[PDB]
Symmetry: D3
Subunit: 173 residues, 6 copies
């Protein structure tokens, strides 16, 4: 089971993320079911948009909304829905939506998976266009869903992101 995946091999610097939606995919919003470990279609998205990075969660974590910690993972090629990426957090995008405070971490693959990100220490080391694409996507992807809305607060750095990982791992027990 996915529950047999640890939150990471090494604390917050070295974590696992289970991908629910590949980057640059069809506008199908998948979510993994806790009981099933199965990929559920939560909705077909209203707007003509795609996730700018792979979107998933850290197994064995618990966030404020009761669900695992949300993470976007940047990769050189989109990964398969349901697959698991060893990665490293570099930032945190603060938002609020219809459901309350909702933050998304952003992460890059571990050095064992690729050398492309060795010099990416903070989200500000990612391309500025990609950061703006992530802000813009979350500001607008729910625009055509009645009863859903998003407000962007701002970004925080890698240390805060790792802080949220530790909090969510302990909240899981």
């Amino acid at each position: 089971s996915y529950n047999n995946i640890p939150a990471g091999k090494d604390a917050p610097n070295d974590i696992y993320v289970i991908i629910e939606i590949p980057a640059n995919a069809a506008p199908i919003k998948y979510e993994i079911d806790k009981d099933s470990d199965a990929l559920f279609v939560d909705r077909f998205m209203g707007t003509a948009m795609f996730y700018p990075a792979n979107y998933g969660y850290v197994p064995n974590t618990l966030s404020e909304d009761g669900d695992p910690l949300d993470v976007l993972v940047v990769t050189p090629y989109p990964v398969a829905a349901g697959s698991v990426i060893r990665c490293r957090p570099v930032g945190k995008l603060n938002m609020e939506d219809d459901g309350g405070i909702d933050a998304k971490l952003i992460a890059v693959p571990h050095e064992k998976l690729s050398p492309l990100y060795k010099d990416v220490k903070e989200y500000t080391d990612l391309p500025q266009l990609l950061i703006n694409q992530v802000e813009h996507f979350f500001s607008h992807y729910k625009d055509l869903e009645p009863g859903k809305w998003v407000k962007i607060s701002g970004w925080e750095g890698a240390d805060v992101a790792k802080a949220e990982v530790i909090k969510a791992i302990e909240a899981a027990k």
Copy 2:
């Protein structure tokens, strides 16, 4: 496990379908294995055809052939093999094949997944070309497999389709 997925949140009007073959996919006929929950390649299809809608089954049901209830689900984008769609049945295509009586339900996504189908109450509310494509596909997709054949009987409406859902759920126990 897939067996931890109920046949639906609400009886026959609101059901879950596990997708084995996405719409418009490569001509690979996948089937989910009961013991494994794993996707098995049952065959590479002989004819140069594709499923006109996503093809799967309702978990926790039992049909006449001993297997779960077959369902085709219409969606705006093909969904991933192995994913689970909350949907609503609108019709039933009656057929017989080498194995005996074989009916396929047809369904559209629940209102929470998309607004595109709110006015689709009966299979006759779907495009006539799509209905004819479904009849034509099942009449011919086995034409190049020795020892396999299909005869189409005809279509029945949404109430009959929901009737078959209830029958298969009770047969599962």
Copy 3:
């Protein structure tokens, strides 16, 4: 050459559209070069969005921005960049950008190409979600290019769309 293609077989009710950007495609804004007839990359789009319908122009027409008349064509499957679709206008989206006023027609394939659009005579006969997606796309796709803005004025019907074809055809003479 593309200039050999008339605006239509029959006036404004039966027109041809040369596609530049397929529906549901990667975020590459191609434009056909008037002289070479070759497909140029105008830009990689800044936002994580995709054209909700195929986008192109009517040959041998002239609009106010000095270019042929813009048209979105709804199709059951996205069509190749550079290919030509016989279609019929059903609506017009009014808007203006920084460059001035700018409208896009919306159209559907001629009945010889597909039976699926027989009952679509006005843009309001298309799914409401699609109309909303087209409007949302043009409102936001340029949000990440500095200085660019688009305000939506609203939709107009098929008669108005055909009027704009008549006008743009004569402007090309």
Copy 4:
């Protein structure tokens, strides 16, 4: 222009084919317009089928239906619509539709393009399932367009295929 391309470097044994519809593609029936050289959408195909091989024509030939000679080209990977393949005929599928008699050649890439077809000298040297798929495709792909019918007469060998090339080349003079 496409008219600058000869029927072949060497007669009927070494020909060129301009591809209109790639193998394994979406069900869009493209046809190249004689005048503009542009790829037109002739129709969206009614049935849930795909061309089992790349489909196109030999430039500077003339058949009985007043159009260049039709040829299917088997390739290890589907080739782009509008591209040109140096190939060699190995068979001919005889049939007639409502429009009259109609035959398609089948061909394989010249040995300069791939070594994979060295031992394919007759269509019977291709996998039997492919030959059956081509026959099944042309028997059924038009089943959902009213009034259209196709009856298969049978296959003929490479010598007959080369005879039809010789003939169609002279008809174009």
Copy 5:
């Protein structure tokens, strides 16, 4: 679980292979996790190459490196990562890498899945180009990974391949 899949319905002539990497896929090297049954991204491959055949392993086997028996499966269309193919071994490619002796079997689908391979009894019955592509891929796919290397020994036939299947099945207990 994948562990509920037998090594095959019938010994070494009729085996199951769980696919980790589809043929002709993105250069993402997936591996199934023993504890999770989940697909892990082991790395993004350095070189600009793709697996020439589907790559997976036989469930319920144990090889020298402690892992299940590696198998490449040739199919007419790439199969989904995580899916299971009933197949039949036809050869064995001997190699050594940074980790020690590493052999890969090669297999074709069982007759129930496709008729395309009935006459393929030995790996030498596969196209010579495909055999050379497999040798070339494994000789070079690690060229841009520091600390990884591969040396090709040579090929062995179907009987040796089935011999390795039996050895690995018994080693699993």
Copy 6:
């Protein structure tokens, strides 16, 4: 026609490149025919490799092999075969094959097309893994075509790349 396209808007710093083979594409080596302007299949590549960047040529240039100047263009998304990209050279890969000496430029999109390459002025400003992939690709892609060989001499900077553009432009006069 493609001949109407100048080598660039501005000399060697601002050039156009006509793409023949998109990045990350199937292993089909297309070449544009000088006369017909049509995309020909030159060969199906023997090795299981793909071009790591889009590959094409500068119009209205002449190299030593009697063909226009070869250029690889790095883009955020692969671009369609036959399309034209406004770009800027940043490096040159020196090598020779059996045919003689042969160099490829590497280039990035003009800032009007994308902001992502502002700080890329020399090829050493691209990810090191990409530079290594390009070198590895050209060293090995022809390994399975008998008699063909390529030896890499090394990379040179942007000034040298622009020198080769100046030279090839005058050779075309």
